[model samples]
Target chain A: PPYTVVYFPVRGRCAALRMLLADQGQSWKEEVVTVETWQEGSLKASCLYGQLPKFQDGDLTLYQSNTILRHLGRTLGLYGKDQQEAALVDMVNDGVEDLRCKYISLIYTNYEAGKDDYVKALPGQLKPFETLLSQNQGGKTFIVGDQISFAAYNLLDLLLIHEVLAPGCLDAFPLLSAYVGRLSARPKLKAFLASPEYVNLPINGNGKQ
Target chain B: PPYTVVYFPVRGRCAALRMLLADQGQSWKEEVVTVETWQEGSLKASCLYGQLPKFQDGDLTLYQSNTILRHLGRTLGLYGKDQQEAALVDMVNDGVEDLRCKYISLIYTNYEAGKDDYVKALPGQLKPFETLLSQNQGGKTFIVGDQISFAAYNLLDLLLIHEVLAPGCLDAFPLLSAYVGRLSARPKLKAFLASPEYVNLPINGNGKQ
Candidate 1:
């Protein structure tokens, strides 16, 4: 394997990149860190930013989920066709990440108290992506351009998990709903989504959506 | 002007990029959005993610500060020497962003109650950057490679603000303290930092920081 992912067993932040790899037909190794192991403190301290989903692309070890995505995108030719398109791709990814951060906050820290409000505000949160798709080729293609970028994979994973969180969250946005369907049906990604590896893993560590 | 920054009067999120533009000696228009203007709701609603700091480069209009920074980096040839160094640059930027989020949360939401704990954890939050600097050329030149990346400007802005927030926060980390002084003294950036445009703007929307 030319790549390795060091993370916990939960799908968590690594899900998007994992899906990207599988869909791109790339093989990678997983270095799972159980809760017991992380509790020991040494491994946590060793991480550059003191967080997980630390990735290795052969000799290059990197941290930060988005950095990993961008690197993979850079290497796999999934960023964009040119600098302008790449900036658009980055814009979309940053938006996805903004919402993703909110999602993580709700799930981990405020699930019991924040879920309802988070759900209520969910439509406003998701509208940007819908608008982005509408501005593009009527949502028929990827987020930024003709080809699927790494941000699209991350955004797909975000929308999928949100659908599970709010059930029918995508109903209001026809483009996003269909966009999800279209991307999820890609042969390689579809298989990975259905596989035991992805199926067995929980979306998050605490059993919340 | 070839570029325009549509943002609030507050430095807030736009500080780094503004500094980057100034330091790089690029002329840009500042479409300053007063709080009164922003409260009108129309402009706020028009923003893709309903956030300020919407940036423009000639015909290209982009939201998200990091995206704008990355775009400038890509276009201005400030990212890195190669694909591998580019990934490293992204890594540093992401780490900077993570800490930045924590800083924003404290300033806006919890300054009254959470300031102490935040200050206490500040060292841990900053250690990664210091460690990063220590690893690369013994903290001699830039964050990633020999030439400075856009991330360095952002990181510099982050460090400077924190120093004001919690005076002498960088004192404990020699490299970071020196790194700030080094980046801040760049002739163009030095002049910009001293100018009324940069100095007059509050660091945050609220009176804090």
Candidate 2:
């Protein structure tokens, strides 16, 4: 049996996993569950971890976004050949998650009270991406290596979401913006995003479907 | 030169590193920075990633609590012999971190609003830990193997912190509490906690100094 990627029809926590699987050019059954449906059966029976974006490969099931990402990276050979590079990739990916947390805090919890602070903090938060891309580019292809890795895809997806939600989001970080644009235009990524499966999900301003 | 672990003289973020290093019986310097001092220098320098607790080993510097945990795990031979065990360990450790986040939210945010949903939710969140420990015990001495891995220490330290913050915190999960007691009574861990350096730090309800 093929692996089943189970998540809400709305792309909330599951988009990254969807994107990762798509970027790898792997075809899996995307099982989008409605909130009501999720609460009814699959959510109760299969969600041992009590979370969404659960991956079921045959009888095996797993949850946790970062864990799933690492597993996919290992299975797909996108993590790295050695431990050090994998650690580096993990660092960058964790950085993306950190940025997401800050973004969520700003928009969700503190939006009305801390809008100005969030806006002010945005430029500073993005500077690291600019610096990292500039330093690691080496006039070469990808973030960690020649071929695109999960980290690269994550960076590109995050930037794309940022641009869509917060216009001129990358204005302060031209190099990072350029790098993101370059990656997004790749045939593989572009094809993945254009697929009917990708467009069919519900994505929010934060890139959650 | 000895490696330096820098954080506010606190156990909140730095305790895991301390526990990891101490479990390995590695010699290292713990540089305690006051909040004011950290705000001035350490915090400024942490922009490389944007958080702590940061670890400096020889010429290398890195941040992110879990990344540092894994790095130290690899260095200290806490990672499992094979890929599968390592992955499971990673999953469990990350799960612990997830629970910690929820715990923080409950105490700091939810509880303040009389939204004790998290308090009610804690038991379910902790069930997996109990199940994992009960199932994986294998009638053996430790969680993973005969010797203690970082996962063991991670759980022990986390339980200790939880107990300190919320007495009877592990009442819902007696197995975990017993497991923590077994792990904590180890000579190295007990000695480390009893030492002047560790003992000198002021204890906060939240496990921060």
Candidate 3:
């Protein structure tokens, strides 16, 4: 049996996994569900696990986007060679989630009232990446090690998504911006971005576009 | 130099790490900080990643509670022998964190409005665990393997804490309740519960007994 990736058509939650799979050159069928369709299917049972980008690999099914990403990372040997490195990757991944949550809350719940807070917080949040980039790669590249980890890909993709969602988002973190620029130029990754599937994401969202 | 675990002494967020450390029999100093003190020193700087339960081993420092727990679990050989089992343990651990967030939001914010969404949701959320336990236990005491993992300790601790915060909270899941009872009877854990450093915090607004 083949692996199946089930998520809403929107890149709202599942883009990272899609990218991870693509990065590893793995081929899996994408099962995109509408909100109504999800309501009537496995989603109702899995909702308490809390939201999407759920994956089913043969008999084993799981939710929680980061966990799913880490699982794939482990399967592909991209997470880390050791537990400590894996934990570090987890820290970076969760940090991205944390920042994503802040962005979502601001845009979804309190756009009018909390817009300033969101704008104000982005620079401070992005500053750590600046310092991380500067310290880790004073002259060379990559966030973790020589090769790209999910952490690097995730940070790059997230930064790109943020830029699309809110332009000038990285204005304060010039070095980190340059770091992302370097990453976005990677041949395979760059090719993936220009692919039909990537270009077709719904406008103004992280999906296909 | 000795290792330092820095946080605001609140069990609400840091309990899992504390339990992980205790389970490992690791000796580390807890640098409890007041809000004022947190603002003045490395505690503030340490939160660059933002959020607590940051751990320092000499020059290396890291944050994210679950990541820290996994790091400790790895160092203590408590994660699991292989990547897949470790990821499964992480899935369960992350699930517990999800449940904790729901539990906190329910008791702290929603309870005041007479919302029992969490109560209504608990049984369904716990059903998967009941199934996982039934299928995976195979007569062994723990979740992943023969010996206990951090996931098991977290599950037991969260269940106990939830019950302490809201009496009858675990009434819906008898197996989980029983599992907690079994885990609580472990002699070393029992002694730790009885230690001077351990205290059952109140759920209500006032700290009054």
Q: B1-209 in candidate 3: lDDT tens per residue?
A: 24678777556666666666665565678887666786676656657475577778666677887777777777677787786677678778878877776676666765655445665666677776665666566423666666678788778777776676557766776667777777777776766666666565332322311
User: Model 1 — interface RMS deviation?
Assistant: 0.8
- Any residue pairs clashing in model 3, and if so which? A201-A207, A201-A208, A201-A209
Fnat of candidate 1 is 0.93
lDDT minimum window of 10 residues, candidate 2 chain B: B200-209
First chain of model 1: TM-score?
Answer: 0.98
Minimum summed lDDT over a 10-residue window in model 1 chain A is located at A136-145
Clashing pairs in 1: none
Worst 10 residues of 3 chain A by lDDT: A200-209
Q: How well is candidate 1 docked (DockQ)?
A: 0.90
Residue-wise C-alpha lDDT for candidate 2, range A3-38, written one tens digit per residue = 788777655456676677776777788776776786
1 or 3: which has the higher TM-score?
A: 1
Candidate 2: how large is its RMSD? Answer: 3.2
Pull out the clashing pairs in model 2: A10-A209, A11-A208, A11-A209, A202-A209
Ranking by lDDT: 1, 3, 2
